[PDB]
Amino acid sequence: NFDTNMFKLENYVKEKYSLESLEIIPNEFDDTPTILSERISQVAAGVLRNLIDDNMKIGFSWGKSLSNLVDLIHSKSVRNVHFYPLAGGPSHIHAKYHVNTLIYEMSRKFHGECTFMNATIVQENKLLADGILQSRYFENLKNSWKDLDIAVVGIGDFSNKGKHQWLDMLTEDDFKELTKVKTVGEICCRFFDSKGKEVYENLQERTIAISLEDLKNIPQSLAVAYGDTKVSSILSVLRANLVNHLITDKNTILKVLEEDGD
Question: Which of 3.90.79.10, 3.90.580.10, 3.40.50.1360, 2.60.40.10 is the CATH number of 1-262?
């Protein structure tokens, strides 16, 4: 039985990576990219709406997967919900995909109070980054990263198209150093290797984002991510248990398993 076998595969992958929650969307022969993105987005929207309750502190990252779920999610009457940025995205992405846009849109549907990301995601040096992170003005947001209830995040790859979004944010030298340490992907604008470790410390210390340490201790952290170019990145995130709830498609998770088996 098809639906049963899907459940078996879900449980298999959850136990394999010690992943708390997982939805695997089936791929259909008649799919277009649009239809597949709708199917994944609707599942994700339903899942998130059910997670949202009164009094919760919810962090968002940036990007298409998130924008697509936000477009579909149904409003709900909850009290005292607060939305925060986990990380600003890079500079030239669609306004629709910007963290502050997503927080605003979610605020409309869940009538929440909003904190926005004002600082650029990568600073020139550690002194400038620390000046922001350690500031009196930034303290509320810094503290809030330590006690979020839910995080909602996409996962980026470090393929040519993945590096694209970062072209005017990271320097030529940043890219060289990231490539030297075999970067495979990013989450919350932090770059990791094949085991989900944040290897390049110089950029790590210049980045205005939640730490991986704080991300990975959020009670419910939902990543929505799929596609062949994302298999290595998803496997890294699973390996390091960076999030505890993943929504992806069957084609992607089978490739993750195959790569892990290598």
Answer: 3.40.50.1360
Delimit the domains of the chain by residue range: 1-262
| Integer Cα distance of 84 and 82 in angstroms | 7
| Residue 181: CB atoms within 10 Å | 15
Decide: 229 and 184 in contact? Cβ < 8 Å.
no
